[PDB]
Amino acid sequence: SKEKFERTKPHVNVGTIGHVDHGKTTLTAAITTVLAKTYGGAARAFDQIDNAPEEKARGITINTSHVEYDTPTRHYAHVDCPGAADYVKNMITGAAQMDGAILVVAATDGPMPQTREHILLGRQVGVPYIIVFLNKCDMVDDEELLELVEMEVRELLSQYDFPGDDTPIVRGSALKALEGDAEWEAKILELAGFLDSYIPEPERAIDKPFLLPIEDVFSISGRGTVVTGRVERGIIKVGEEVEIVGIKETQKSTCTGVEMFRKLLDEGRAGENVGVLLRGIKREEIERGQVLAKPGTIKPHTKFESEVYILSKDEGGRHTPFFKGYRPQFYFRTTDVTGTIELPEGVEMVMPGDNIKMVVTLIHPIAMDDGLRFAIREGGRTVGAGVVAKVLS
Amino acid sequence: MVTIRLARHGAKKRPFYQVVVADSRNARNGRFIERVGFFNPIASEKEEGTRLDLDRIAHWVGQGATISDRVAALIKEVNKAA
Amino acid sequence: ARYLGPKLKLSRREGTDLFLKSGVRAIDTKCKIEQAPGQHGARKPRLSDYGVQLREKQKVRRIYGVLERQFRNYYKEAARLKGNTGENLLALLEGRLDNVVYRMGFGATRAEARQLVSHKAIMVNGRVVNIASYQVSPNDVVSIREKAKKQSRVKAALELAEQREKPTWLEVDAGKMEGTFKRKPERSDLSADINEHLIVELYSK
Amino acid sequence: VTSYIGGEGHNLQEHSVILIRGGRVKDLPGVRYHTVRGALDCSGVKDRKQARSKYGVKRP
Amino acid sequence: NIKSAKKRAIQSEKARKHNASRRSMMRTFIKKVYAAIEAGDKAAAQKAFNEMQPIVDRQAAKGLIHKNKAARHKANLTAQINKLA
RNA sequence: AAAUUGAAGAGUUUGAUCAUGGCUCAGAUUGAACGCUGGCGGCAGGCCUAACACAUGCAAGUCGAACGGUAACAGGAAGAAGCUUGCUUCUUUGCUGACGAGUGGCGGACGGGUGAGUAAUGUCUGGGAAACUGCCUGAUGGAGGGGGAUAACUACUGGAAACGGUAGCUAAUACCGCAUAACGUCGCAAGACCAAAGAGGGGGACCUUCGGGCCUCUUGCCAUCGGAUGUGCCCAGAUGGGAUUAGCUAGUAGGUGGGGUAACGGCUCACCUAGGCGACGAUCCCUAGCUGGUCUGAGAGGAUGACCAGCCACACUGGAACUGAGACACGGUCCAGACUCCUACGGGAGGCAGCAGUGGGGAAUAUUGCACAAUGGGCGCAAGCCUGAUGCAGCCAUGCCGCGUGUAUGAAGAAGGCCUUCGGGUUGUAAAGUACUUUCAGCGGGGAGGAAGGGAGUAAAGUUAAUACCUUUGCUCAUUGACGUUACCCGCAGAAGAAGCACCGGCUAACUCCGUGCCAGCAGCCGCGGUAAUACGGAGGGUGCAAGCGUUAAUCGGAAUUACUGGGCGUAAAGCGCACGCAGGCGGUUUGUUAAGUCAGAUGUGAAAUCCCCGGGCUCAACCUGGGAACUGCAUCUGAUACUGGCAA
RNA sequence: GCCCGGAUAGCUCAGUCGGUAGAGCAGGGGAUUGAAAAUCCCCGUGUCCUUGGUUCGAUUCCGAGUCCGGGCACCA
Ligand SMILES: Nc1nc2c(ncn2[C@@H]2O[C@H](COP(=O)(O)OP(=O)(O)NP(=O)(O)O)[C@@H](O)[C@H]2O)c(=O)[nH]1
Ligand SMILES: [Mg+2]
Ligand SMILES: [Mg+2]
Ligand SMILES: [Mg+2]
Ligand SMILES: [Mg+2]
Ligand SMILES: [Mg+2]
Ligand SMILES: [Mg+2]
Ligand SMILES: [Mg+2]
Ligand SMILES: [Mg+2]
Ligand SMILES: [Mg+2]
Ligand SMILES: [Mg+2]
Ligand SMILES: [Mg+2]
Ligand SMILES: [Mg+2]
Ligand SMILES: [Mg+2]
Ligand SMILES: [Mg+2]
Ligand SMILES: [Mg+2]
Ligand SMILES: [Mg+2]
Ligand SMILES: [Mg+2]
Ligand SMILES: [Mg+2]
Ligand SMILES: [Mg+2]
Ligand SMILES: [Mg+2]
Ligand SMILES: [Mg+2]
Ligand SMILES: [Mg+2]
Ligand SMILES: [Mg+2]
Ligand SMILES: [Mg+2]
Ligand SMILES: [Mg+2]
Ligand SMILES: [Mg+2]
Ligand SMILES: [Mg+2]
Ligand SMILES: [Mg+2]
Ligand SMILES: [Mg+2]
Ligand SMILES: [Mg+2]
Ligand SMILES: [Mg+2]
Ligand SMILES: [Mg+2]
Ligand SMILES: [Mg+2]
Ligand SMILES: [Mg+2]
Ligand SMILES: [Mg+2]
Ligand SMILES: [Mg+2]
Ligand SMILES: [Mg+2]
Ligand SMILES: [Mg+2]
Ligand SMILES: [Mg+2]
Ligand SMILES: [Mg+2]
Ligand SMILES: [Mg+2]
Ligand SMILES: [Mg+2]
Ligand SMILES: [Mg+2]
Ligand SMILES: [Mg+2]
Ligand SMILES: [Mg+2]
Ligand SMILES: [Mg+2]
Ligand SMILES: [Mg+2]
Ligand SMILES: [Mg+2]
Ligand SMILES: [Mg+2]
Ligand SMILES: [Mg+2]
Ligand SMILES: [Mg+2]
Ligand SMILES: [Mg+2]
Ligand SMILES: [Mg+2]
Ligand SMILES: [Mg+2]
Ligand SMILES: [Mg+2]
Ligand SMILES: [Mg+2]
Ligand SMILES: [Mg+2]
Ligand SMILES: [Mg+2]
Ligand SMILES: [Mg+2]
Ligand SMILES: [Mg+2]
Ligand SMILES: [Mg+2]
Ligand SMILES: [Mg+2]
Ligand SMILES: [Mg+2]
Ligand SMILES: [Mg+2]
Ligand SMILES: [Mg+2]
Ligand SMILES: [Mg+2]
Ligand SMILES: [Mg+2]
Ligand SMILES: [Mg+2]
Ligand SMILES: [Mg+2]
Ligand SMILES: [Mg+2]
Ligand SMILES: [Mg+2]
Ligand SMILES: [Mg+2]
Ligand SMILES: [Mg+2]
Ligand SMILES: [Mg+2]
Ligand SMILES: [Mg+2]
Ligand SMILES: [Mg+2]
Ligand SMILES: [Mg+2]
Ligand SMILES: [Mg+2]
Ligand SMILES: [Mg+2]
Ligand SMILES: [Mg+2]
Ligand SMILES: [Mg+2]
Ligand SMILES: [Mg+2]
Ligand SMILES: [Mg+2]
Ligand SMILES: [Mg+2]
Ligand SMILES: [Mg+2]
Ligand SMILES: [Mg+2]
Ligand SMILES: [Mg+2]
Ligand SMILES: [Mg+2]
Ligand SMILES: [Mg+2]
Ligand SMILES: [Mg+2]
Ligand SMILES: [Mg+2]
Ligand SMILES: [Mg+2]
Ligand SMILES: [Mg+2]
Ligand SMILES: [Mg+2]
Ligand SMILES: [Mg+2]
Ligand SMILES: [Mg+2]
Ligand SMILES: [Mg+2]
Ligand SMILES: [Mg+2]
Ligand SMILES: [Mg+2]
Ligand SMILES: [Mg+2]
Ligand SMILES: [Mg+2]
Ligand SMILES: [Mg+2]
Ligand SMILES: [Mg+2]
Ligand SMILES: [Mg+2]
Ligand SMILES: [Mg+2]
Ligand SMILES: [Mg+2]
Ligand SMILES: [Mg+2]
Ligand SMILES: [Mg+2]
Ligand SMILES: [Mg+2]
Ligand SMILES: [Mg+2]
Ligand SMILES: [Mg+2]
Ligand SMILES: [Mg+2]
Ligand SMILES: [Mg+2]
Ligand SMILES: [Mg+2]
Ligand SMILES: [Mg+2]
Ligand SMILES: [Mg+2]
Ligand SMILES: [Mg+2]
Ligand SMILES: [Mg+2]
Ligand SMILES: [Mg+2]
Ligand SMILES: [Mg+2]
Ligand SMILES: [Mg+2]
Ligand SMILES: [Mg+2]
Ligand SMILES: [Mg+2]
Ligand SMILES: [Mg+2]
Ligand SMILES: [Mg+2]
Ligand SMILES: [Mg+2]
Ligand SMILES: [Mg+2]
Ligand SMILES: [Mg+2]
Ligand SMILES: [Mg+2]
Ligand SMILES: [Mg+2]
Ligand SMILES: [Mg+2]
Ligand SMILES: [Mg+2]
Ligand SMILES: [Mg+2]
Ligand SMILES: [Mg+2]
Ligand SMILES: [Mg+2]
Ligand SMILES: [Mg+2]
Ligand SMILES: [Mg+2]
Ligand SMILES: [Mg+2]
Ligand SMILES: [Mg+2]
Ligand SMILES: [Mg+2]
Ligand SMILES: [Mg+2]
Ligand SMILES: [Mg+2]
Ligand SMILES: [Mg+2]
Ligand SMILES: [Mg+2]
Ligand SMILES: [Mg+2]
Ligand SMILES: [Mg+2]
Ligand SMILES: [Mg+2]
Ligand SMILES: [Mg+2]
Ligand SMILES: [Mg+2]
Ligand SMILES: [Mg+2]
Ligand SMILES: [Mg+2]
């Protein structure tokens, strides 16, 4: 909180996706040390990406950490996702804000169950583009074995409905590029080139009014409570009226400084992860899931009609019918929430793989409008995608 | 050092100064020996505007008391022969 | 700040005509006056000693268009002033600008006079005044401004004032809408019906 | 201390943080306080119309 | 500390190095008289008094010693010389 | 002429009664909180709790007219070198203005903050000598001639940094002699002894050795005696609760003598005496900043001491001194302690009870804003720089006060609701409907008043050899606002954007119908609910307040329920079981005589604000404000002798 | 942000390793009283915290949640 962030080079939200213990977090560390040395940006290190007691004694990552590496064309903002089956909820928040992923499949093990689960969540939420990275390579000194893993990833993406064969697969060791090997430093400099080439300039919504979903809340010692998240639409000027809408009720507030990776900003534009400092709010009373909207634009609702598309076994979801009283988890912008289903008259049962509308009473109210996209999940897996039809409350 | 200075009372945007003989170290509105007239900048042309008891000024200025930049101008405003 | 409800309802509850909806026509005969305060209008009240005090207070308030907070302030001024506390209560009420504007005949009702005062029409001693509560001092000259002079509401409302008793303490020109408040109003000049003594009794306890 | 729970029905159980105001019930001997309905975990009374500042209920 | 007027710390420290030396000098010349007082006639005591009289008056004029301090060290010290000897 | 115009009761023990006596209620009121609902404005206010812990920026500097600095920086002038000979390169010059770092001055001790401690060291009221006092200001008269240093800068090193050392070198209003000194200090006096600093704005005349000298003038310097303002100390009374705290006390209580204090003193010593306080409450314990006041009261009193004003106290916790006119020093120093801190492990930091802000605590209490424009403050000849002092702005119905949310007409007495003896009533002129406004919001244009000044000029005066420079000035210039899209005005559009929430058995203003059936619930007191509830829940209807309303808590009132004004004690609570009796309270009667009480007068004082009355100014009000009265007092001084006391007889 | 425990008819507790859950204490219906209490004669009065899955069948086995309990961290 000192150096003013100059608005130069387009902002893009990147992040690593893939199986557990697969080089996902270690890739993030390799990208920093490679790009910092040659181009001449800020250095950083691997330990900073995940410290705490929970990511040392174990080794695994839980929290969605963030990194800021710069290149001549664009200014990237990384989002290192967790990866394990237990941490899918706090991942989806990291994956939703992310524009273009970096998938991580490995040349020894290959595509494994979570890789399929991650990319499934990527489609239904919103992950336009994806890039593969083989994160072992050196351990198996062979030409035929390593190239057979590439084939199965192209199959995976194309099977699940991505380009597949068009996606630029890259090979490279994360640990070798951490030290100073000239051949492996250049091969992850190549990944930065693939990020610029394949992923285009993202399409922002800097016109329609302000909204910002809260991904994580902080309490800065001196300044006050801060909320982080990608600005979904509009802009944020310093000293502007902001209404916090969602769970519990609704509270009035004002912004007192927006930032971008511990650097000051004047205008927090759309499509970029920013830490908004709110005035006169406690750490406990503001929770995760709520949205920073402009006063009057959005209203919290506990009941709504919605055109729900239930999934079948082939697409990946339920395989049995259900009646009124069923309670799955509804993932809106960031958080999830439970809700009772009330079906329309003249519909006895809801079969899997079917398009119908339904009234859904939620236990917590969440800020929503007509034409909001959500993805229903239950039992550690997906259920059905859909859209909001009408407001009731 | 004793000094003859304005005290600043009155409402917000509506000042009314009590010209007063006080010690330099004491606060503007605080301690004083004795008040010696007043000043009203938002009085305008009417019955009352500015009063300043010139008999008590000789007791302080004659001995050794300074007069502030504004109170010195009001001694010129009240005049000796005008 | 104002009542702004059913105005003739107040007159039936009180019994007597309060001049709330006096207006263009002289006598109403269009409410079942006296014998219908509400649904249970045929109910004869027992009416205690506190009742008659409260009814008399609420009558004087509703006539002049003043709320308890501002009305209780008139009592506190009336007590501190010289003479008699009862006579001071009502003399201060009569000195209001909205009341004077009504008594001059620049308003069919007292609520009309209040709006006329509030909407930059009324002007006194070469100075525009918005406040209905403006205490009109002895020897004053209230009048209407030339932009809003001889508008449709005033010329008709001034013809009503001929049928009225017309106070002695003030005088009206009538040609150019120019009034003259002269002396303070005497007790015996006005009313001869609303009791002051009972209002003094309500507040002293 | 013991405190009375006014109105019909309540959400209070086991724990749940609540606000207490003064006021004896004059019927339960020992109970000399009232829970403020509406404040904190104590919700408003369900389906009230008349006298709703008491019992902490919003407009219909 | 969080100020640029810390010159007064080093200036007051510089003062008392000087201020203590002139003070210490004075109270030793006064001790020189009290040394002569006790076993002695009017001769050795008054010689020490004539030596300290200029020093005590001087230091009083500089604001180290007050003028009443100096006045006493003549007043009471003459009374030791006059009464005993 | 005006300064008080002031004293209300009701429910509740009983089958009923009168008494006693608690309980509750009607009114003011607040730093309030909470619940429901929220339009504006104006003036006020807004961490009472954890004197809990704290990141970030900021709250005290200032002069070149003290001094070295011929300058760290940016720019003129004598002269230089390139070459587009005025475009560029560039050495000298206090020399362009100034000023980073110093050295010395004055400030930092004021201004802000907070009540932890403190029951007397403090505060209040009234006195009192043993005192000091920077800046200001009266008078007198000095200020004369010298010296050795020393930073900065180098030079050379040490250190991670904070911060040093070692070799020079240099300036002064820094520093110290010396002469010089009295109505000064000391002494019985004779005597002795005690100081200083110089600057800046101009000059005819003559010295020029050019650094000019000498006239000039403003300012400073120094000694004394003074005023003024501060402060230090002393006494008297007053200033909370507990005796289920009765004895405390050895520098303790006083003396003589020495030291010390600006000043007197067990302030502190040495010896000497054996005290001193104590029932008119010492000691110990718990609680507490104090006052002007605030709120309340018919008044006596009772409570309280947020905001504004005085005093004290304290500054991370516990100590000590240094510097100074003033501190045993909020944003100095030095130790030690606890907690945060950074490092290179050697050592270093650090102090929000300045302003914002954070976490935590809590029922609860706000911007990391703008501005020195004004008003004070700091230095300075000034200009100015500095200023979270002050002035504004934001937020918050937290109060007090103003204006809002339409205004006339309107019978089919419509619909719909609600009630009914189904005839009708009532909601209700309510609405709709027609006629009009257009405050305030919302737009669009005018635009004060807070501004006095300061400067560049000038004019005569001031001042002098001088038609100079400074002192005072009066005329001509162009300017100075954070507030600020200002106060307020004028045009626009159209009722348009602008109403709730208590209560309705009695006390206490206002009633029916359904639902429920000692259940659910209400309740400030009495009490409501057991299948026809005016008390519960809803509905209609009313009443009372209305941008507020109620609930909670807190104080007084009513409570003559701690009673001095103003209660009691045969049986309601209450005469010790009955004596004697010291201290204490009270005392027949007549002369004295004082004057303590008492009374009268008079002077001084009782800060300002507050309160009160007559004005005045903001469109009105709250708010601000002039004068008066008052501040019920305390002191002294003169009297009065009836009474009370004293002392005689 | 993640680890863990806790929930069984109105209240206090039994019962389970798939065999479809019970006890007291209440509550209700009737005869009786103005209504009760006792007296007499009859009744569990249940979303096994919610929801889904493995199955013929789940309180009971395995996910996902609810509000609450206590534990460890992150400083734009
Ligand atoms: N030999 C080799 N090992 C590698 C390479 N890249 C990563 N690894 C290793 O794979 C392991 C995975 O660690 P990490 O990347 O933190 O795990 P992750 O991919 O973020 N998944 P999650 O966070 O869910 O545990 C580490 O031991 C890492 O050193 C590579 O190129 N070569
Ligand atoms: Mg593995
Ligand atoms: Mg990871
Ligand atoms: Mg592992
Ligand atoms: Mg494996
Ligand atoms: Mg395998
Ligand atoms: Mg805040
Ligand atoms: Mg003082
Ligand atoms: Mg003027
Ligand atoms: Mg009001
Ligand atoms: Mg009002
Ligand atoms: Mg009364
Ligand atoms: Mg320090
Ligand atoms: Mg230090
Ligand atoms: Mg000195
Ligand atoms: Mg010595
Ligand atoms: Mg020594
Ligand atoms: Mg000599
Ligand atoms: Mg000296
Ligand atoms: Mg000195
Ligand atoms: Mg009175
Ligand atoms: Mg009574
Ligand atoms: Mg009674
Ligand atoms: Mg009895
Ligand atoms: Mg009774
Ligand atoms: Mg009875
Ligand atoms: Mg009786
Ligand atoms: Mg509140
Ligand atoms: Mg509230
Ligand atoms: Mg609240
Ligand atoms: Mg306002
Ligand atoms: Mg204010
Ligand atoms: Mg406090
Ligand atoms: Mg503390
Ligand atoms: Mg602290
Ligand atoms: Mg820090
Ligand atoms: Mg700090
Ligand atoms: Mg800053
Ligand atoms: Mg600072
Ligand atoms: Mg110079
Ligand atoms: Mg000069
Ligand atoms: Mg000096
Ligand atoms: Mg102070
Ligand atoms: Mg102040
Ligand atoms: Mg203060
Ligand atoms: Mg503070
Ligand atoms: Mg205080
Ligand atoms: Mg005193
Ligand atoms: Mg006094
Ligand atoms: Mg006095
Ligand atoms: Mg002097
Ligand atoms: Mg001095
Ligand atoms: Mg000066
Ligand atoms: Mg002088
Ligand atoms: Mg002189
Ligand atoms: Mg000479
Ligand atoms: Mg000589
Ligand atoms: Mg010389
Ligand atoms: Mg020399
Ligand atoms: Mg020398
Ligand atoms: Mg030398
Ligand atoms: Mg040297
Ligand atoms: Mg020298
Ligand atoms: Mg000197
Ligand atoms: Mg000599
Ligand atoms: Mg000599
Ligand atoms: Mg000489
Ligand atoms: Mg001589
Ligand atoms: Mg001599
Ligand atoms: Mg001499
Ligand atoms: Mg002499
Ligand atoms: Mg003498
Ligand atoms: Mg003498
Ligand atoms: Mg002599
Ligand atoms: Mg000298
Ligand atoms: Mg000198
Ligand atoms: Mg010089
Ligand atoms: Mg000169
Ligand atoms: Mg010359
Ligand atoms: Mg002088
Ligand atoms: Mg002088
Ligand atoms: Mg003197
Ligand atoms: Mg003097
Ligand atoms: Mg002193
Ligand atoms: Mg008072
Ligand atoms: Mg009063
Ligand atoms: Mg009173
Ligand atoms: Mg009384
Ligand atoms: Mg008190
Ligand atoms: Mg007190
Ligand atoms: Mg208080
Ligand atoms: Mg305070
Ligand atoms: Mg204030
Ligand atoms: Mg304050
Ligand atoms: Mg104060
Ligand atoms: Mg004092
Ligand atoms: Mg004192
Ligand atoms: Mg102190
Ligand atoms: Mg102090
Ligand atoms: Mg402090
Ligand atoms: Mg200390
Ligand atoms: Mg100390
Ligand atoms: Mg000094
Ligand atoms: Mg000293
Ligand atoms: Mg002194
Ligand atoms: Mg200080
Ligand atoms: Mg200290
Ligand atoms: Mg201070
Ligand atoms: Mg501080
Ligand atoms: Mg300190
Ligand atoms: Mg130690
Ligand atoms: Mg230490
Ligand atoms: Mg320390
Ligand atoms: Mg603070
Ligand atoms: Mg806070
Ligand atoms: Mg809290
Ligand atoms: Mg609050
Ligand atoms: Mg600023
Ligand atoms: Mg400026
Ligand atoms: Mg100034
Ligand atoms: Mg000065
Ligand atoms: Mg000067
Ligand atoms: Mg500063
Ligand atoms: Mg500032
Ligand atoms: Mg307001
Ligand atoms: Mg509120
Ligand atoms: Mg309307
Ligand atoms: Mg109408
Ligand atoms: Mg109408
Ligand atoms: Mg209409
Ligand atoms: Mg119309
Ligand atoms: Mg209009
Ligand atoms: Mg119109
Ligand atoms: Mg307007
Ligand atoms: Mg506008
Ligand atoms: Mg001017
Ligand atoms: Mg102006
Ligand atoms: Mg001038
Ligand atoms: Mg000038
Ligand atoms: Mg000039
Ligand atoms: Mg001139
Ligand atoms: Mg303007
Ligand atoms: Mg401006
Ligand atoms: Mg119209
Ligand atoms: Mg309308
Ligand atoms: Mg029914
Ligand atoms: Mg029943
Ligand atoms: Mg029952
Ligand atoms: Mg029951
Ligand atoms: Mg009720
Ligand atoms: Mg009874
Ligand atoms: Mg019944």
Ligand SMILES: [Mg+2]
């Ligand atoms: Mg019924």
Ligand SMILES: [Mg+2]
């Ligand atoms: Mg009843």
Ligand SMILES: [Mg+2]
């Ligand atoms: Mg009732």
Ligand SMILES: [Mg+2]
């Ligand atoms: Mg009812």
Ligand SMILES: [Mg+2]
């Ligand atoms: Mg009810």
Ligand SMILES: [Mg+2]
């Ligand atoms: Mg009504």
Ligand SMILES: [Mg+2]
């Ligand atoms: Mg109503």
Ligand SMILES: [Mg+2]
């Ligand atoms: Mg209110």
Ligand SMILES: [Mg+2]
């Ligand atoms: Mg209230």
Ligand SMILES: [Mg+2]
């Ligand atoms: Mg109360």
Ligand SMILES: [Mg+2]
């Ligand atoms: Mg009493």
Ligand SMILES: [Mg+2]
């Ligand atoms: Mg009481």
Ligand SMILES: [Mg+2]
């Ligand atoms: Mg009695």
Ligand SMILES: [Mg+2]
């Ligand atoms: Mg007796």
Ligand SMILES: [Mg+2]
């Ligand atoms: Mg008895």
Ligand SMILES: [Mg+2]
């Ligand atoms: Mg007795």
